[model samples]
Target chain A: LVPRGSHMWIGVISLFPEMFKAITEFGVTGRAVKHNLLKVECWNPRDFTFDKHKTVDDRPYGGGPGMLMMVQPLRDAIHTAKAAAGEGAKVIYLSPQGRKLDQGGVTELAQNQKLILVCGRYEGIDERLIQTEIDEEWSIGDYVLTGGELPAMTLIDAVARFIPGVLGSFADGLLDCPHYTRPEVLEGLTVPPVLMSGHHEEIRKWRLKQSLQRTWLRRPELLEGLALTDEQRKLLKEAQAEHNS
Target chain B: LVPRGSHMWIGVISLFPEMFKAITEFGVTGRAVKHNLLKVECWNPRDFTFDKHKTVDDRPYGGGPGMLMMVQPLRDAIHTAKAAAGEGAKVIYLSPQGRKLDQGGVTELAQNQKLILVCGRYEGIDERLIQTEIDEEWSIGDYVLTGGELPAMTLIDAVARFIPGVLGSFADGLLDCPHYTRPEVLEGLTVPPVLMSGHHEEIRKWRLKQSLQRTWLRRPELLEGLALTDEQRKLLKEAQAEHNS
Candidate 1:
């Protein structure tokens, strides 16, 4: 098993190094690095290519529009990152057609020793390479992103927090209830009164309801396959009641 | 306006600091800091309170669920971040019911010299503060994320690429065409023939058609407001005809 911090190492293979740079600079992921909880490394596919012009894409064989990413360069880069990540690492490629990412997947990935992510561009990398080298395919959502980098980042952030020490407190995960800030009334919208009441039990119950309600309203499919405990069922019922009330 | 990298700062006001850290340590966002394009700062609302417990949340006045984030503490943090960003900065709060983020909104934020992002947890931020202090509400999509940090990071990644010098090529934005990989034939699906052809003009035409078709099929609303050029119209027509065929 890879150590907790070791699970933090994420390798990205892409043609645009600057794109990767822009993504890593600020926001939540940056904080993880500052706190010594995560590490990210970028590898350019061009660097792994043998072409004199360092070309990483070419015309597809069977007819398509955009240039297809050459298989060898991406394959080489993925292998290189895997080797760099050492023994117990897994390789993930971001694709719109991959298995959808959810809370469970995030938790599972958090246990990995290391993750090497490949961000494909153009048409995509050769299928041969993905079949041969990729350990898994992860999708951020059903929507298509311009590239794989955003999904990769999303997965890293979501999964990293599940690691024991990555988050300062275990309850941090549970604290993700709906939050509101100052000026309790705005443009005819009023703050939910339950939030202001000094009752801790009510507050906890409220949070649980809201989280479940919000998830159900926005992504009911997420609730479909999961086995719910009696407490979860009660919480979900309360959330639904609140919504109706 | 704050000069370039000097003013772009994101501030998170959350009771759970560890939850916020999940953003900073992973993926492309982590690399962004290495390249010095964005900055992330976390402020625990509890930090600003004078109470022995450093309480940053309070019970709702009308009696409901969840504690509302205390207004004064969040306001103080927002003010601090704005001051640090200097003049011409926008304060954005993330909310489920906020104006949904689209390509245009991301592009606009990308141009700002500085931005202060507030991530609210529990029921929501005090409505009064949102009206008085918040500039805009940005939502990544119709779905609900656990918190604002993920959306904020997504926005940053999308917008940063549009900033001059931040991306290796401005052309990268226009290059997201349908991608297919090897096997040339998979489960009876074959790559579109136009892709394999080396004719640049035909390839460009095919890509334009595919982009429009993909957009129309997946996000039809996005195309409604988009102004189409003569060439774009022609491509759309060709794509439509092909679709029917």
Candidate 2:
């Protein structure tokens, strides 16, 4: 048996398990899956149904706008995924009613060795299932999507970034600095001269100053709680002066 | 030429345009696509590149830890997407530095007849492309993902919900009420009595009360700005009393 603490193992319970292919087959997360840094398994609730037609959703009690996932199939799938994922695997359901997810939440989720993400379809999973089986609930933001698959993919992508060697990068302390690539000039937009200075320390300082300025200008809330260095303060002052001038 | 305002048209600039199949071929967005209510087209930045390598990414100027997308291809792709999408198409880039996206933002985006979404890969696009061609940038949340593709998909899915005939259900004013399905009893947990009662008005009031209580318990911030009806105030009082009891 593989040890519970061995790598990042994510087992997902979803109606449309195929949607996960987007992450499993592409980009940095795909590379992580290929490199064995991550393991993702999908369990479809539709597969767990006992009915002849294999029905998994039904009209909600109290009869509102939409259908809700029946408890039996979803609960069974969650149990099966938890078993396959091994111990220490937390079952997280994606829902708007859950706590809003942020970078801090992503960092925490990345620390776990195993997780079972429940992607509720239709209106949502039965509340009893969530009350009994789910360990945590996370919302990507205030907005709602068709189902939890995108949010599941979003959580995986965000958490995968924190996994070791996933990114070949926060960096999250401030908004990223402007990035320029080859071709010193493109349609009258020239790469900043300091980048071409060939002075490593100056280049590093320039990047940092630009980051500070971008954060100050675009996302000042990120600057509010952050403790700045003497250098950062000085750079911010210059940025403010430049803005005013 | 098809009139630009005939349907919800979205033009995406992405390296991994195939990834969009996740949304375009599945769920509510897929249904909308099939119903002729929505149109999606993808423009590959790689296709716009003139180099033999078809390289869209290059190391950032000033020598960062990661690469930045070069300007020429992305700018060209954005221009092409804009032209194809026609008048009133707003170019939106998904980035952490952009305004935070929420349900309110989703509603606004859904009002647009056309949108060109730019998905940045590598570190990010050259800042010049954003300054020159992009009309707006929106971030899904605070956490970072591998690229802008997921965020773009997220924006589309969220916006699609608000599109006419998309969701077959806000609901945004409050957290959704808990739902129960068939088999009045599941593993000894019975459906709520109010739901099964033949009284429609009582069922509606019960759902409202539940939503109020759930919002109050889980996300009180949503309730703070909301103007409650007299019945809502009474239901909320009863909900609080029930909790205390």
Candidate 3:
């Protein structure tokens, strides 16, 4: 049986709500939606705009090449989304201006029962809206995108993996060791003999050693934050020697 | 006139090709697709599977909780995708184990005339395939996702922004200042007076100062890498004094 906190209700405010269908109808996210473990509601700012054009964007005050998401409709949409999400809902604006997101943040965000993810289009929304309405801003990485939709989708996907049942299992603190599946040999490359040997203890040790070696070689900086076990230290030392040899 | 390198041909190797419609059919990415500024083609690995089950995944050799994408079909798919993409095409596999992506990488990737983006599903693909086929690996962030589809879309969205005319304009080395749009006031929050003053020089100075202050306060680490101009240095010093006062 899985933990109940595995379920989540996510409200998204975006200009392109149709794009949400990509996540909600496919893969693990789709399965979670189908099982009711995850509930996604899209609130379109255009729906809240009363103007004839139903315009959600306008030219910036200081004059910029791109438009900014007008404040009124987005503010109203966020308000409506908050009311639907109820209490304890965190309002997050996905933007380059926010805190850089990582696995640590994902774990923290996964605990929230409700999430209102705001996707900004155009250059960005009015600064006043962010100051008055948003609880926090989060960037997927340092990169900019066409809009915040992809980042919001990314956040949902990453956060969903931690919602207990969404991912069948998980990991922590290091790059994964390479995984191989089916066919013992492909393109003349056979599965590592250790895996095929079927010795549980050896297999477990082999994986851990590989994890240590891979992390040490590829992203050694990750080790700074990790509290290494005595066994891991020994394994890494041996891995270093083996590589050097 | 837009540069010719602005046009790109992207080949994606994925199990769920339908998911890409979210990008290729909407927003700025859609506009690029329509204008022929960008072309995206999907290669599904299942098409290469000869099995009756069309089995694209199988249990890991060393025993894992979830299945890993099998090697044969995926390898075959990558080869086919490479042929279509032609010369100078870079093959990148999206995974948590890869280098974290940033705007720097986005700019670098934008230069490639052709790209074959590999989307891994299940736990991951066989290491042998990665060793032999993939030119490089990239991660959107430190977190894990259900699959690589979202990361691929994110990479596309970011890289497209640099493809000459994809973004009508752009920025460098600073978080953006707040932007405002029509009505000038909403929810009792008026647009900053400096923007309304109508002095182009004053507006420019105000924006640059805001960008300096925002970057200095929100992400001080970013300032370290930036080659601050004399005006920027003065603005940041003044901002510091004003905040402390």
Candidate with top DockQ is: 3
lDDT of 3 by residue, A124-224 (tens): 98888888889999999888898999999999988888776776712658788878876787778888999988899998888888998888898899989
lDDT of 3 by residue, B218-245 (tens): 9998889988889989988988899899
Best by TM-score: 3
Tens digits of per-residue lDDT, candidate 2, B67-121, equal: 8887788888888888887788899999988899988889888888889999998
Instruction: Give interface RMSD (Å), model 2.
Output: 1.5
Estimate the TM-score of every prediction: 0.56, 0.93, 0.96
RMSD of 3: 2.1
Model 3, runs deviating above 4 Å: A1-5, B1-5
Choose 1 or 3, whichever is better by TM-score. Answer: 3
User: lDDT (CA) for every model shown?
Assistant: 0.64, 0.85, 0.87
Q: Which regions in candidate 2 have their CA more than 4 angstroms from the true location?
A: A1-6, A169-172, B1-6
Better of 1 and 3 by DockQ: 3
Per-residue lDDT tens digits for candidate 1, residues B71-175, read 777777777777777788788887655665655567677677677778765455766676778898766543334346666656665665554443331132222
- Kindly give the stretch of ten consecutive residues in candidate 3 chain A with the minimal lDDT sum: A163-172
Q: For model 3 chain B, give the 10-residue run with minimal summed lDDT.
A: B163-172
Candidate 3 positional error at B10, Å: 0.5
For candidate 3, what is the recovered fraction of reference interface contacts? 0.82
Candidates' RMSD to native:
8.7, 3.0, 2.1
Docking class of 1: incorrect
